[model samples]
Target: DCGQPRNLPNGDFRYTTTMGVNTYKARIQYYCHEPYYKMQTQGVYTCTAQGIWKNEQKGEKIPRCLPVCGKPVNPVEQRIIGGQKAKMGNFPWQVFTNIHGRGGGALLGDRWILTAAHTLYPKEHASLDVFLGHTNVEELMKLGNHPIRRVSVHPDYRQDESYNFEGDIALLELENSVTLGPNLLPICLPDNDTFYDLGLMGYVSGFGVMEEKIAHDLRFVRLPVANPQACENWLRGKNRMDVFSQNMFCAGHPSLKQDACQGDSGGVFAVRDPNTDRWVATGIVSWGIGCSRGYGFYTKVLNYVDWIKKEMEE
Candidate 1:
């Protein structure tokens, strides 16, 4: 009769001693109440024989505490040179867009965000703010600073300079809703647009402008998925006039263009949701040519998930 010891938000737990049990098997000893959190299990637990309490992965062993959210004992596991630093909360839905930081946004829930409608500027859009789960934008109000209450563009928006910037996406709304901690969460938009078109391999971030030219902070790499007819024959061989289709698409990495640049315009191209392994806001960075060099353009969130589900149901 011990099934009420699971009150965890960030963490808190400690056990040992369970009476002179004769319930066939009964013993416990747990931990994880330190410096914020950490514990994937292995503190010991077992109390079964049908009287149940064996958590053999999930028999109710209960002890998966996780969340020391400043984790970066060793990052830079792939690409993203000259700006290596992102392991704490490891891309917790990225985001940090608006306010002339030049762009970046993801975390598609708990108030929504999936940016790039030119990174919202309807009179500075109420001074933008959405810095969840931290990665150091100088500490982002200490982390999880959501604001912004509505901005849904893409009803065919066009202030175009063309490179096929198309409707360029946008959708923010959170005067208050966020609450999925341990950094924060939400993502998984595209369910079809070929589900990020077959050759998928996304993951973009911002605080752009790099390639060693330097910008602010918050970086992340890996995008893959290019070659839409060689990105429309390399922007019509520089004569420019291609305007891609199927609601825009193209990622980088075809000979070290590194990938995404110029403050990652309305960033977070993220992907991977094999039924729900997490991270899948697909694309929305919208346009790129130098920083990674060429072919970057994005904005294919399942072609707009039917207008991002009727503006998140109004």
Candidate 2:
């Protein structure tokens, strides 16, 4: 009976279709307008209503499917070379502090600093100092300690996922506001739509680890940016989009030789902003697969413009 109701309690149903496919004991669950069926042989199934099944003169088999998984692409290790000091008054036009204790930070305003949330840990530290008006750390330190009034990390920064590489950005407030000099200024933040194609050159500097295995004094480097698609392909199925958010960007060699490593984290990865005519802070050196190999990633700076602005206001 084509449209008649048939009741079989906890029973099995077997059938063969014209496609040479045989199905046995296909478990089925039914509801008002929908019937779910699963094939035991191919592990495939479909859902349709009894009305549709009875009214259709012909039925077609659905396609079988599976899930895909992938990994993250690593970037190459980057090298550093001492160059002439950057000119005063550039976007991201700010200087950072080596902190001398744990982490580093960017000089936002005369008295304001921006850093990673983790930098505020270990409550036993003394006053936070700022190094200004000098490109060279030794030279900057020689100038003397620029005192900080108060320090604040992001309120929601979670240490458990510190290496997860998200929400790691922070800001600092100085005790006494200073004047902006040759080496003392704020760096520009990149526009939200700023995209880096292949061969786009950018720079990164920090007081983080120099060698892959150990922390070093301080260093800086200039490297070219690569396309996100290229990096995604290298990762080969890992949800590249999920791991690398819109606020994140990557720059490094496909080979594992040049990249940002430890201590480099939370530093700036910036490019020249032609419209603003300055080098802007486009990325925050976030994390990477491993320092030894040639892969690293950075958080895109522009994505958090509102957050930065709000935080600064507070």
Candidate 3:
């Protein structure tokens, strides 16, 4: 008897031909979790008399799974919004959101856009037009604007003009599901237990301002995740005490002029998933003292994934 079968990585298994016990001739089946992974091969294994698990060997190895979301088709091999102009498909999940003015968001699913709560509040009745799969701002309208069917803003989100933002994440449900293609896809959200190390570089993108003028094409920049204490100290020095809430983190260069600006609020701070090498959104652009003068604060997406999933289901 082969004890209990091994668990599948990024997946799970169950008994198909059970002997009530995992004894001789017992069969099991496996599959990757949906919406996040896809099985790479058939998953059927049997318990052998030798107390081992074996599968049919037709030149195929043991079943495995691959990440279905967050993998981009045309991402930069290794790469910035001080920032650079991203091509049409470089960051397919980047979205341009228009409510009162230009904002940004991440396509978390076929019909859900993850953004900042501050961007959508006080404008519940206003129209939210979403634009995806394009680089040039001029093409936003021509590419067909998507409409919001529902908006799920966090209940605890409290916005203050002085950068006192908390629970700043929001999820927008699109009226119609978008078809995923080479130039349009969804980014992955970090797992609940995922944590980031200080000084690790992550990317932020949007149609935000460059110097003084708003960028025409999508722009991205690489910023190191700042140390929480150091970020707070800097803010406190500037008399912005207690601005960095528990649900938020900061990222930016100490003195570089590269940062997410006014129009960039609600965009995503995406980092490469360690195991899957796919883009996982780690933060949302929430607030800052000034453009490039100080580290910009972002809503911790990892802290809100459960809320996001719950809102999506409801």
Candidate 4:
């Protein structure tokens, strides 16, 4: 007889057949335990007469449960861009941050908000407030402020005179875990080897500048990934290439008047994961020559996913 099946992490299994415990021909089904986890493969397993557990595929291993991030409960159904007002749940991971000045952030989980290190850099020792679950700027106060418990910026950031926006990412630990729902959730970080195709559209949202005036409500716009050489050349011509780095990339239209602006720093430049059809944060709003001038630089989130998790663990 085969021994009891191994336990699944962040998941559980149940016997499906009335077979004796761990006995031959015993069948079982596995499932992920968390609302944020999903099974990676078929979960059916059977104890064979040869004292081993096997699936119909014979040599298949037990299924894995991976985190189901970036899937919003309510998502936008159509394509729209150019600083339009956002819906209540269209950008569930968005966070409104007040740290010395207005900035934006993305909720990475119930307890952590990820943003540009420069946004939190200026006020590292000061009190900060963040608001979630709503889009209207006027309604944010009523939703209540979530105090920051801790701020973890990349250790290599601003290490020397060469620092402009390298390692611009930061994580804010909320004093209390958020109650995620239809209008509030976390965005997924891109996998280590994830790559964005050139000209792929990404959505960026925040209460940033529009018409030389700060927005009263959250606004969103779609911008395509810019050509790297063109972006670098533009930055070089503008004498702003010092801010560019391997950990950052350019996204936006050069003349379409679509780009992140002042007060939008720390917001996510998110794209849909083609495989899972989920929104993944590819980058963070870092800097640019100016608003709507095109091809703004962003902190590439994939490069720092490991650093982010390590900080979260500590």
Candidate 5:
């Protein structure tokens, strides 16, 4: 028979386990801290696997899982100013929005835009009108805006301590595929595993705020990649163990001066592949300390290529 609750920690409901010689055992695992307690502070306890007749021994303890914050890597500025001479077919130079204002994404293919899952509201997703492609909201109607075909969020995305800000990537599809021009081109994904090495340089571009409490038009920056060990040390005071996962990469200076700010989430973290001689996207801008801060983090793209390809196919 099965025992222990599936929900974990809070649900203590138990069952029986049968062994040789007519022996029966009961076991239970639960968290000392209950509802509303963050996973970091919660304690796990497992009762002794004694037979059904005997009382469960005092439970053994396990470590708690917590969340971490911060990333290194400054934002690169690339703005499309007014009267900049529209490229052929009127394709947008970049994808943008002022809805959340803080979170933004990048235009990949004519129909596909990349972004983070956390950027959307938990309930009632943001409206398509909020998205600003080449022109600002005020000029969207006049410029002949592209209607949203659909929004695709990753199925594995979870908002808990384990995967909170880490795997938060998503895609948006436009109603019609856009025509390509000098200003319109899909960023390339990394072809090899060179991004796994330390000290590799990467670039982040976005329309995020220029500094804290001040939004900028658009910009870009190049930052050196921070090794996982260095990133762990930088985040030591703020739940580093949880944030520094093998699938995630950190970059930027630790001074808290350079980072991909609010508007930068879901942007591309491109790396130059020496072997392929191409600028390949290695990560997606996930989250960071703040616009003015020095550090920021990204969702490692190589780790989730399979998931991305599957979603694109659908």
Candidate 6:
């Protein structure tokens, strides 16, 4: 009992070796805490028959916790029209939302993931795994899986007869802050509401449905921002104008071939930063009349940055 292991700032662990009795052949293992760091060494320490911990001051070392590495670069040659194959790290913030792997989400911070609030509704949060990095879903199935610790849905979001997609943003907190390497990284949130003009180019992506079937790999499309007026007119023509709101924005191509669809919900719709060459997530794929239509509505994430921050801080 006198030789208890000391805890470190980035991590701590418990040892169950014979510290007081049968001190022979007992062992201690090391581990790292999540949403931040992991163990570097085996964290193994054995006990000797003499009732003392073995070889700590001499050689048997405890694992160390270190900062997560991050990679935020955008991909150059990833995808096709209706959306094709993507290169690794194309969407550095990309996060798969469901355990069944049908929904998509974005990483906006070390501890938080952004998604359409609907993704978590009526589903067990415990059944989800936050798949990070990698473009190949088949390969991703084997590794790079992070367990979700909590899901925070926006309180105001509701799906009803009004049938409007509003306040649909949600945040996911991972069990541990990931190790940001080539593909796992956070996308910057918009600092200003007016960062994009009507004609500014944008990108949308995810492992969403294609031809009514789930895509085996990630896909992306280049969609330019259409005039909000045009989007409103289209909605009005369909008697769905109530679905359009200030908290939502629209982006798409006129041809209807490069739009995000069902499974793409909660994926990132971002604009490139001229200064940093990085993408800033401005929208979370919300809803639309049809895939690749003239335009689709997205959760205007810029309007909810404060709410996101407040919730994450709390």
lDDT of 4 at 128: 87
Can you write out model 5's per-residue Cα lDDT over 175-232, one digit (the tens) per residue?
A: 8766433334445555467775777777665666554344434455666777767667
After superposition, which runs of candidate 6 have C-alpha atoms over 4 Å from their true positions? Answer: 1-71, 78-81, 99-101, 122-126
Backbone clashes in model 3, listed as residue pairs: 80-220, 80-221, 81-220, 81-221
Report the C-alpha lDDT of model 2 over 57-173, residue by residue, as the tens digit. Answer: 222332222111010011113332222223323322334455545345565533566665545442233456666555456766787877765566555455665444455577776
Clashes of each: 3, 33, 4, 1, 22, 6
lDDT of the candidates, in the order given = 0.65, 0.50, 0.80, 0.81, 0.53, 0.71
State, as a TM-score between 0 and 1, how close model 1 is to the true structure: 0.32
Highest-lDDT candidate: 4
| Per-residue error (Å), model 2, residue 149 | 3.5
Residue 196, candidate 3: how far off, in angstroms? Answer: 2.0
RMSD of 4: 6.2
RMSD of each: 17.1, 22.9, 8.9, 6.2, 19.8, 8.3
Better of 1 and 6 by lDDT: 6
**Candidate 2 whole-model C-alpha lDDT, 0 to 1:** 0.50
Evaluated at residue 40, the lDDT of candidate 4 is: 72
Candidate 6 per-residue lDDT over residues 105-180, each given as its tens digit: 8876666788987676632323776687777787667776677777788877875524666788888888877666
Q: Could you tell me the TM-score of candidate 5?
A: 0.61
Residues 256-313 of candidate 3 have per-residue lDDT tens digits of 6788887888899989876787889999998886686768899988899899999987
Tell me the TM-score of each prediction against the true structure: 0.32, 0.58, 0.76, 0.77, 0.61, 0.73
Model 3 alpha-carbon miss at residue 253, Å: 2.6
Residue 67 lDDT in model 5?
A: 15
Clashes of 4: 1
lDDT of 2 at 218: 43
lDDT score, candidate 1 = 0.65
